[PDB]
Design a binder for this molecule. Structure first.
Ligand SMILES: [Mg+2]
Ligand SMILES: [Mg+2]
Ligand SMILES: [Mg+2]
Ligand SMILES: [Mg+2]
Ligand SMILES: [Mg+2]
Ligand SMILES: [Mg+2]
Ligand SMILES: [Mg+2]
Ligand SMILES: [Mg+2]
Ligand SMILES: [Mg+2]
Ligand SMILES: [Mg+2]
Ligand SMILES: [Mg+2]
Ligand SMILES: [Mg+2]
Ligand SMILES: [Mg+2]
Ligand SMILES: [Mg+2]
Ligand SMILES: [Mg+2]
Ligand SMILES: [Mg+2]
Ligand SMILES: [Mg+2]
Ligand SMILES: [Mg+2]
Ligand SMILES: [Mg+2]
Ligand SMILES: [Mg+2]
Ligand SMILES: [Mg+2]
Ligand SMILES: [Mg+2]
Ligand SMILES: [Mg+2]
Ligand SMILES: [Mg+2]
Ligand SMILES: [Mg+2]
Ligand SMILES: [Mg+2]
Ligand SMILES: [Mg+2]
Ligand SMILES: [Mg+2]
Ligand SMILES: [Mg+2]
Ligand SMILES: [Mg+2]
Ligand SMILES: [Mg+2]
Ligand SMILES: [Mg+2]
Ligand SMILES: [Mg+2]
Ligand SMILES: [Mg+2]
Ligand SMILES: [Mg+2]
Ligand SMILES: [Mg+2]
Ligand SMILES: [Mg+2]
Ligand SMILES: [Mg+2]
Ligand SMILES: [Mg+2]
Ligand SMILES: [Mg+2]
Ligand SMILES: [Mg+2]
Ligand SMILES: [Mg+2]
Ligand SMILES: [Mg+2]
Ligand SMILES: [Mg+2]
Ligand SMILES: [Mg+2]
Ligand SMILES: [Mg+2]
Ligand SMILES: [Mg+2]
Ligand SMILES: [Mg+2]
Ligand SMILES: [Mg+2]
Ligand SMILES: [Mg+2]
Ligand SMILES: [Mg+2]
Ligand SMILES: [Mg+2]
Ligand SMILES: [Mg+2]
Ligand SMILES: [Mg+2]
Ligand SMILES: [Mg+2]
Ligand SMILES: [Mg+2]
Ligand SMILES: [Mg+2]
Ligand SMILES: [Mg+2]
Ligand SMILES: [Mg+2]
Ligand SMILES: [Mg+2]
Ligand SMILES: [Mg+2]
Ligand SMILES: [Mg+2]
Ligand SMILES: [Mg+2]
Ligand SMILES: [Mg+2]
Ligand SMILES: [Mg+2]
Ligand SMILES: [Mg+2]
Ligand SMILES: [Mg+2]
Ligand SMILES: [Mg+2]
Ligand SMILES: [Mg+2]
Lengths: 271, 46, 94
RNA sequence: AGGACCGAACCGACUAAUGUUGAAAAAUUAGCGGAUGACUUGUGGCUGGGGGUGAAAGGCCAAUCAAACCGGGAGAUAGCU
RNA sequence: GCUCGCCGGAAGACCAAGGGUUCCUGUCCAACGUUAAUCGGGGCAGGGUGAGUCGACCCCUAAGGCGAGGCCGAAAGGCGUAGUCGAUGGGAAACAGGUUAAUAUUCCUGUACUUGGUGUUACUGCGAAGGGGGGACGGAGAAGGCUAUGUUGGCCGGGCGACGGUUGUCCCGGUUUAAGCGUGUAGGCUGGUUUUCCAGGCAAAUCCGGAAAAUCAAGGCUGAGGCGUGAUGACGAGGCACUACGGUGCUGAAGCAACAAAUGCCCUGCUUCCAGGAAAAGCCUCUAAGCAUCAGGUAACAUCAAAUCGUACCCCAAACCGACACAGGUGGUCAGGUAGAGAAUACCAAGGCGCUUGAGAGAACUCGGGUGAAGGAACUAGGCAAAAUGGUGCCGUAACUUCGGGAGAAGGCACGCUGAUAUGUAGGUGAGGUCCCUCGCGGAUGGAGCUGAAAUCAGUCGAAGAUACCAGCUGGCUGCAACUGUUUAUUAAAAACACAGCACUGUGCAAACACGAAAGUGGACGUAUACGGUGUGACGCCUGCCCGGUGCCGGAAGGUUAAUU
């Protein structure tokens, strides 16, 4: 649930927590963990390639299963867990054969729930099956774009995709953006919405919170000198130019999709 | 006042020492130049 | 097994000094100048063969050379290895 | 509980007088701000010059910065002194 | 040498880094030392650094570096796989005393430990580049148990006072002892043991994981400290022999108890929070290829082994970074007493220093301080600077408010010492005795002794009792920025930047975008509740009209329009 924190200090006043009690209070499943060091938004050349990334808390990498290939073995959900690497919550499941995996926790899922991957599997939340097997009109998440690859669409805290149509070897998805997109019908998909839907109701409430999430501050181009950004300079507050990136490209409105290889799959762009 | 030079031997060696110089082409060139000049101490190496 | 030839080369001199004398008298320990490359075992071997005397143990150390000035010109003395060699109880050395 | 409060260490640098061929090429003494954090600090690492880095002052990049230093083109050119 | 003064969370002690002989001894005083110098971190000579257990090396890895092939690139070269390097992190082992002019966990004395071989007898499934476990981990908070350490008493040794008193409830000193081995406690974690099966752990697995079934409620792991031993020893106040006045040799009493007590240890624990908290080896275990009655494994016992390099000295400084013997800078560890909340402050201990020019004088003026009649901001751009306020407890406290605040609002009262309450209370601690007992570091009862606030009443001294040091000035109206933060190293700390929040806009994943002739990398092991860019800047009430201009978005009928032909 969302919880507005009492204003016992400024910087706590405007804080709203999203507190789920059903998460595992404990150390995560250590076999599925692995190291994940921070970039600082800097590439192999050592240059900053993406501004405003830096610091934040140490995090392990939970190895989430997005491919979801244990066909026919029924799994049972052991627990829901906090993943620092994503807006969703993950769920530690236990297959009948003794293997454990992390998956994206879907909306209704909780400890004890049984889930299943495969063509044969029951059309119920958390179950995973090819989109030719999934009924049209259903909400799905963790959608593969290429068969066998692993789920790429609808992974974020409260997302889901609608299967609007199945026309032969393809199905048309209504993506969360509003883009309608053709996808091969043999591509896999998990039933239902992804879990942590009140994630968006959280409000950080202070500068420090942002920092804790590894986000360094962002300086406004207009606050700079002309040598630094296109918006810089001016005595007092001036801004007599069309908005643009730090590299001079228009920012308010100018479209930047150039991919002519996948234009065929996009049925309708978002609006 | 913390002045600019704050010595550290390992750091010095890694930065400027013989092996570092050797490692790259420009470093090698520098060494060669030094040799030509007649430098007694070819590198920072003690 | 150290070579005879090697052994002969190892041991450079006896070291005369107050401390050395004291060591000799009290602790039955002789203070030698040895080759800088000479390991402890080798030194011991040399002692046993060349002085005919049982060795309890050898402690070594490296003495660093002093920097001196002969007139205007600066110059460093050589480093050299000192060895305290402790002889077994009752071993009297000439 | 807290980018909560008072306050030493620690980090800073608002006022003052002193110094200004200094004790010091930015310090002093007296007060002053922060002091569980967007904190501070050791060791090592990475980013290189129209390049880096910048909670943005054209700041900082070895007492050097509206384009570092070293060497070279080079005895640049100087209707000027 | 005797006084005096200063530091004492340091101006003391021990290290790292850095330096590199500055250490110690003798000797010399030209230069160096802001003066003299017999002295010196100066000159010259000699001496000095001892390790299986400390550190490096070594084994393991992090960020990152290099990188066979490889991919990419006019050349140079870039990126990167296998790998291999890389500590600031993980990995076996030593303590006490004694000694040098100068080293010591390194020498000596005592008492220990480790992991390797080799050989043994005893046994008999061993075996990895692989599987599993483990190592292995955050912040804050709270205690409880402890010790370091200190205080008092007892004990032991010495003392009987340069001036009134001082054979006592008097004075001074000491009262120390390790690792190791054994015990396995306060306490923490977990249900164990056996059997059967199984699409999992790249193959196999007797291991792990998962299913069942049986049976027993104690099983195991962890763990400070204490106690015992170690120790008939060592050390020991000071006494006693020699004396090159440096010291050397002999000798040696007591060596207990209580209370207080860490920020250290149990604790890598527990509780809790969200921001969700390295890796790999050593270590344990499982098997595969294999070998097969051999090796290898564990078992004690014997023996051999542990090389190499560092070890002086300075290390908040006269030895390092600052040109200087420079008011500067410099990470870690140690942390006594009285007062105190305290690592603040004051005075002291241990220990270390008086800052390498002195001597006079006692003008103006300058610096740093003290006090000041009457007035009290009249000063001045401005109360700048000074002055003042300043503690604990209790009473009391407005507007306004986002209901948290405002607030330590404001303002007041009490405060010492003595006695009594109470030859020391409330509390804390807790010995004998007595009882129980699955027997121990056990449980009950018991209260000796020890420690010990706070209050009330009564008296009492002073001008003054938070007496020194230490230690808020307060209130009223108002601009700006919500707030904590950041910034021009060295004339600007702000109203500037940032900020949570808001909006627009791009981006469907080989994402947009960015760094790269490219390969590739970041974005992100993220996927539209996400990421980028732009503006605005908490919260509240809001955010009007204009698309002609310039941009952007969409359109494509016509006009115009490149290479090409
Ligand atoms: Mg951003
Ligand atoms: Mg923003
Ligand atoms: Mg901004
Ligand atoms: Mg500006
Ligand atoms: Mg421009
Ligand atoms: Mg203007
Ligand atoms: Mg205008
Ligand atoms: Mg040695
Ligand atoms: Mg605070
Ligand atoms: Mg404060
Ligand atoms: Mg600053
Ligand atoms: Mg000051
Ligand atoms: Mg340039
Ligand atoms: Mg400007
Ligand atoms: Mg500079
Ligand atoms: Mg230029
Ligand atoms: Mg020319
Ligand atoms: Mg010229
Ligand atoms: Mg004093
Ligand atoms: Mg010298
Ligand atoms: Mg000396
Ligand atoms: Mg001398
Ligand atoms: Mg002189
Ligand atoms: Mg003279
Ligand atoms: Mg000298
Ligand atoms: Mg020895
Ligand atoms: Mg060791
Ligand atoms: Mg690497
Ligand atoms: Mg490479
Ligand atoms: Mg190659
Ligand atoms: Mg290695
Ligand atoms: Mg290390
Ligand atoms: Mg180590
Ligand atoms: Mg010494
Ligand atoms: Mg393993
Ligand atoms: Mg913690
Ligand atoms: Mg004690
Ligand atoms: Mg003790
Ligand atoms: Mg008297
Ligand atoms: Mg008298
Ligand atoms: Mg006494
Ligand atoms: Mg013991
Ligand atoms: Mg030493
Ligand atoms: Mg000191
Ligand atoms: Mg001086
Ligand atoms: Mg100094
Ligand atoms: Mg104290
Ligand atoms: Mg003090
Ligand atoms: Mg002086
Ligand atoms: Mg005067
Ligand atoms: Mg005054
Ligand atoms: Mg007056
Ligand atoms: Mg008077
Ligand atoms: Mg008056
Ligand atoms: Mg006037
Ligand atoms: Mg006036
Ligand atoms: Mg003032
Ligand atoms: Mg004052
Ligand atoms: Mg006004
Ligand atoms: Mg502000
Ligand atoms: Mg800063
Ligand atoms: Mg400034
Ligand atoms: Mg200033
Ligand atoms: Mg990519
Ligand atoms: Mg603004
Ligand atoms: Mg408007
Ligand atoms: Mg328009
Ligand atoms: Mg129009
Ligand atoms: Mg157009």
């Amino acid at each position: 649930a969302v919880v507005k924190c009492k204003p016992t200090s400024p910087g706590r006043r405007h804080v709203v927590k999203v507190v789920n009690p059903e998460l595992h209070k404990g150390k995560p499943f250590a076999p599925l963990l692995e190291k994940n060091s921070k970039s600082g938004g800097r590439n192999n050349n050592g240059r900053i390639t993406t501004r405003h990334i830096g610091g934040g808390h140490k995090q392990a990498y939970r190895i989430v299963d997005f491919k979801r290939n244990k066909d026919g073995i029924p799994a049972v959900v052991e627990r829901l867990e906090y993943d620092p690497n994503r807006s969703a919550n993950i769920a530690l499941v236990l297959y009948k054969d003794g293997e454990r995996r992390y998956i994206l926790a879907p909306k209704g899922l909780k400890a004890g729930d049984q889930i299943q991957s495969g063509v044969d599997a029951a059309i119920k939340p958390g179950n995973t099956l090819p989109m030719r097997n999934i009924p049209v009109g259903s909400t799905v998440h963790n959608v593969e774009m290429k068969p066998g690859k692993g789920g790429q669409l609808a992974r974020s805290a409260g997302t889901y995709v609608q299967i609007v149509a199945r026309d032969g070897a393809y199905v048309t998805l209504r993506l969360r953006s509003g883009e309608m997109r053709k996808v091969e019908a043999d591509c896999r998909a998990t039933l239902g919405e992804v879990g942590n839907a009140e994630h968006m109701l959280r409000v950080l409430g202070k500068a420090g919170a942002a920092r804790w999430r590894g986000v360094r501050p962002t300086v406004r181009g207009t606050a700079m000198n002309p040598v630094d950004h296109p918006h810089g300079g001016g005595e007092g507050r001036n801004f007599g130019k069309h908005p643009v990136t730090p590299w001079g490209v228009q920012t308010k409105g100018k479209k930047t999709r150039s991919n002519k290889r996948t234009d065929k799959f996009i049925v309708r762009r978002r609006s | 006042m913390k002045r600019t030079f704050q010595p550290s031997v390992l750091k010095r060696n890694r930065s400027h020492g013989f092996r570092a110089r050797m490692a790259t082409k420009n470093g090698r060139q520098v060494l060669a130049r030094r040799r030509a000049k007649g430098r007694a101490r070819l590198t920072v190496s003690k | 097994m150290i070579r005879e030839e090697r052994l002969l080369k190892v041991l450079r001199a006896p070291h005369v000094s107050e401390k050395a004398s004291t060591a000799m008298e009290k602790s039955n320990t002789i203070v030698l100048k040895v080759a800088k490359d000479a390991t402890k075992a080798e030194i011991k071997a040399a002692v046993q063969k060349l002085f005919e005397v049982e060795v309890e143990v050898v402690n070594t150390l490296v003495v660093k050379g002093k920097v001196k000035r002969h007139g205007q010109r600066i110059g460093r003395r050589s480093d050299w290895k000192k060895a305290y060699v402790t002889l077994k109880e009752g071993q009297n050395l000439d």
